[PDB]
Amino acid sequence: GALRYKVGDFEVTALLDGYLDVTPEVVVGYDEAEGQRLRDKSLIEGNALRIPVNAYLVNTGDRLVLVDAGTSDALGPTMGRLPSALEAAGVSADQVDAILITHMHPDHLFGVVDGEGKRVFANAELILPEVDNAFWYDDAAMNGAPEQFKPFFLGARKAAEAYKGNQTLISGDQEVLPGIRSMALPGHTPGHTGYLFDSNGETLAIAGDIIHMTAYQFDRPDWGIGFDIDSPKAVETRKAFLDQAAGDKLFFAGAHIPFPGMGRVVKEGDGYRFVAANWPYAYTGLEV
Amino acid sequence: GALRYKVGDFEVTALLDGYLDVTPEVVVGYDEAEGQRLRDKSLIEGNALRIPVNAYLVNTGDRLVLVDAGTSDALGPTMGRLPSALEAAGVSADQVDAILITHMHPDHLFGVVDGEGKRVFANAELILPEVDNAFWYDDAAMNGAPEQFKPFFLGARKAAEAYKGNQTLISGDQEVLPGIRSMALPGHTPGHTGYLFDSNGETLAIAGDIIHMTAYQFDRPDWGIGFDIDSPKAVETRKAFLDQAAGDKLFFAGAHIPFPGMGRVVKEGDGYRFVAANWPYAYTGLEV
Ligand SMILES: [Zn+2]
Ligand SMILES: [Zn+2]
Ligand SMILES: [Zn+2]
Ligand SMILES: [Zn+2]
């Protein structure tokens, strides 16, 4: 679960932290006739979709930066593969210089701490969108939260705090590191943020949880998922993101797009068709 | 360039030998207005398509069988990756017991011998389709071939002769090993052959060069490629194959389908749409 691409002078390695299965009862706006038509289009039997959890290592030439860090053990044994995906890519955890968090959900942030609350990445700066940090640290929010979801707030704080004195809070429109700009993508969480990478005239947008179920939400970008804090907002941000991406032919990556999670969209009627990136033939089998 | 799937009790590993680039002049039946439409559909700029060269390792339980063997060094440094893909899959060349050849073209057969013309797979039986063997050994066919193509005949013969005494010729509808049957797929070469894997009510058809350019030939299965020895017969075989594959939702693999080259088709009009296999998340990620 490690695949390496070139973006100008940057190397981007897709990393598979694992997978989870979701059924229609988490889908906002779901209808069964339409759900079945969409599953039949992808030759999917039954109503479970298997969704990857992806993170991306970017070697900018002078820093090694992770976008998201998977789950650790928080959601069971089907996740937390990120540390061994890193080994596959020839990288140890102690070489990571910075971790850019799209949002502070379990499957993006919890992989930054181990079982003891020890840092997985000893030498990394933890970079958090400050709008998301504020939410997860708000008690009004945490106490108004369905009891089964309170562990998310608590777990998010514990993960962030293992990086006390090595955190940078960022806004949704700022240069973060050379050739990395944040991009506000609010809705899924309040401070959900994508990261735009640019090197030598080439671009990759790492767009976090802009989409969860690619079997449904390219065709029906109006469908949400119950884990969206603000589902109508998330819908507006996805439609805006995909409209832009389609018109610019922007290469993007998504945490829950079938691994490696990278490609482009064509606009089609009132939805989109994803065109997956080709396998990196030359990079792996020539260039280096 | 090694990905592992399960078909019943068989483990099937896709192996990437490398890639090559093709432009419209090799396409039989090509039309520029349609070519550009199909390239726009896949967001391809320019008119070059990069196609993989795939081979497949099948562990049957007690035996390691390759379907095809890549190119070696015979078409330049963009191919010949197979020995290193095998290494990445934790297998060395001396462990391979049998090589089932779909057809004796360079990108399938010549990977069985190194630059000095000695066996790459010291312990393997070379299994050749009898009908294709007959064609490549035909002096009349070799002598009536364009000058640039005569070395394909001579190189086929040398690669086969490296395995003299450890060769088995097979017919186009026979059992090769338990759960593995040959199936004639004539046209691309006279004895071009696919292999059908059947284990515990799961099937995989490894269909060789049934298709070359997936950006065109699923939409336009009536288009051929100049390397088809009889392009009309190749078209007929391809249409019959894809027609059956679509009606039974057969999982199949192709040597030139974007790596890992495995998936299914749905019929749309008198063309087809390819649905690529999911990444093998569970098999390679939930381990004992
Ligand atoms: Zn999320
Ligand atoms: Zn997520
Ligand atoms: Zn061929
Ligand atoms: Zn071929």
Numbering used by the authors:
A (entry chain B), B (entry chain A): 49 to 336
The authors write:
To gain experimental insights into the mechanism of catalysis and self-assembly, we determined the three-dimensional structure of LrsL, showing residues 49–331 at a resolution of 1.9 Å. The crystals contain a symmetric LrsL dimer in the asymmetric unit, burying a total protein surface of 1,135 Å2 in the interface. Size exclusion chromatography–multiangle light scattering analysis confirmed that LrsL was eluted as a single peak with a molecular mass of 61.2 kDa corresponding to an LrsL dimer. The LrsL dimeric arrangement resembles closely the one of AidC, with an r.m.s.d of 0.952 Å. However, AidC has an extension of the loop between helices α5 and α6, which is absent in LrsL and most other lactonases. The crystal structure of LrsL exhibits a functional catalytic site where the conserved H151XH153XD155H156 ~ H236 ~ D257 ~ H304 (superscript show the position of amino acid in full-length protein) motif residues and one water molecule are coordinating two zinc ions as the metal cofactor, akin to AidC and other previously investigated lactonases. We crystallized LrsL without AHL but noticed an unoccupied electron density above the zinc molecules. Secondly, LrsL shows a unique presence of three phenylalanines (F197, F200, and F275) in a position where they can coordinate the AHL tail carbons C1–C5 particularly well, suggesting a strong interaction with the substrate. Minor differences were found in the side chain orientations of the phenylalanines F197, F200, and F275, and in the orientation of the helix carrying these residues. These regions have an elevated B-factor in the crystal structure, and hence the differences with the AlphaFold2 model may reflect this flexibility which could be related to catalysis/substrate binding.
In this study, we report that one of them, named LrsL, is a metallo-β-lactamase superfamily QQ enzyme with outstanding catalytic features. The QQ enzymes hydrolyzing the lactone ring of AHLs are called lactonases, whereas those cleaving the amide bond are amidases or acylases. LrsL has an unusually hydrophobic substrate binding pocket that can accommodate a broad range of acyl-homoserine lactones (AHLs) with exceptionally high affinity. In vitro, LrsL achieves the highest catalytic efficiency reported thus far for any QQ enzyme with a Kcat/KM of 3 × 107.
